[PDB]
């Protein structure tokens, strides 16, 4: 068949490199990925160490023309695209097509905010990290290097949390009534024949 649905990865509480490696392999396998909240990814090392690595990264630049040189993107959604692009084939149609099916956003935009989010267990920071090891959110590092839109995102996420709070509360009310209504159908005597079948296989 054809994979038209989009796998949505919640990049909250994940490792930057280990998310990219799993995403890069599955991009070559034809899947379509959209990684939301690519600014909440974590990297090893304190903020001071991350800045030293960044300042070394900023050094690489074409001497005769810095406009031809390496472009040092500072947005975390571009710090993940760079990480993913490194793990994909270079200079062939296979690599370009695989990268064409990837997106990061700094939050959850309009179409992807109501989609089923997935997770990559290999890339979870709670499994691959000593808890005492100090990390750094990609959003926090982005602000320190010149990413201006860090506080715009914090405003949008705050309004997304509060809008999902009322939707969840209303849904929990309906689901409780539906659950209790079903218990009345299960206890009903007209549905006794069907209930015995469910009890036989443990569904009830």
């Amino acid at each position: 068949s054809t994979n038209n649905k989009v796998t949505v990865i919640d990049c909250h509480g994940h490792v930057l490199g280990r998310v990219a490696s799993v995403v890069a392999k599955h991009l070559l396998l034809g899947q379509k990925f959209v990684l939301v909240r690519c600014e909440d990814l974590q990297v090893c090392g304190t903020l001071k160490m991350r800045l030293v690595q960044w300042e070394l990264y900023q050094r690489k630049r074409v001497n005769t023309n810095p406009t031809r040189g390496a472009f040092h993107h500072r947005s975390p959604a571009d710090m993940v695209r760079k990480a993913v692009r490194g793990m994909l084939p270079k200079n062939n149609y296979r690599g370009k097509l695989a990268l064409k099916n990837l997106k990061c956003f700094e939050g959850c935009p309009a179409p992807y905010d109501k989609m089923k989010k997935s997770s990559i267990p290999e890339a979870a920071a709670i499994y691959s990290f000593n808890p005492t090891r100090k990390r750094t959110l990609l959003g926090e590092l982005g602000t320190a290097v010149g990413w201006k839109y860090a506080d715009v995102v914090a405003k949008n996420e705050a309004e997304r949390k509060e809008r999902a709070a009322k939707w969840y509360a209303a849904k929990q009310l309906k689901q409780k009534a539906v659950a209790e209504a079903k218990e009345k159908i299960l206890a009903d005597e007209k549905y006794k024949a069907k209930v015995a079948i469910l009890k036989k296989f443990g569904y009830a």
Binding site: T2, L29, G30, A98
Partner: protein
């Protein structure tokens, strides 16, 4: 009408670091996560069904297929080897194939 197959991903050909042997193709069957689940699929049918935008002046079908069989497992992650009548086009890498339920042994 009904789903009678398991979608499989044409990962690539059986290769080495700097070589490639397009006689054997590697597939990833959806749901097989270890080499101990592959023995069921050894010998089943596999088809690469694709669509060609034919013209109104041609009797060539708009839907074609290349058929093959799964012959052996490949590593401890449930990747298989499949031999087809005609080697799959590398333009079809990352596409979905069909793993049928026949020839059945049940």
């Amino acid at each position: 009408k009904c789903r009678l197959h398991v979608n499989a991903v044409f990962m690539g050909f059986q290769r080495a670091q700097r070589n490639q042997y397009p006689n054997v193709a590697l597939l990833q069957i959806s749901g097989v996560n270890t080499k101990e689940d592959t023995p069921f699929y050894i010998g089943k049918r596999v088809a690469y069904v694709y669509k060609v935008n034919v013209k109104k002046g041609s009797n060539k079908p708009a839907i074609r297929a290349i058929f093959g069989k799964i012959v052996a497992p490949h590593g401890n992650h449930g990747v298989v080897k499949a031999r087809f009548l005609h080697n799959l086009p590398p333009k079809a890498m990352g596409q979905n194939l069909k793993v049928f339920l026949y020839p059945s042994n049940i």
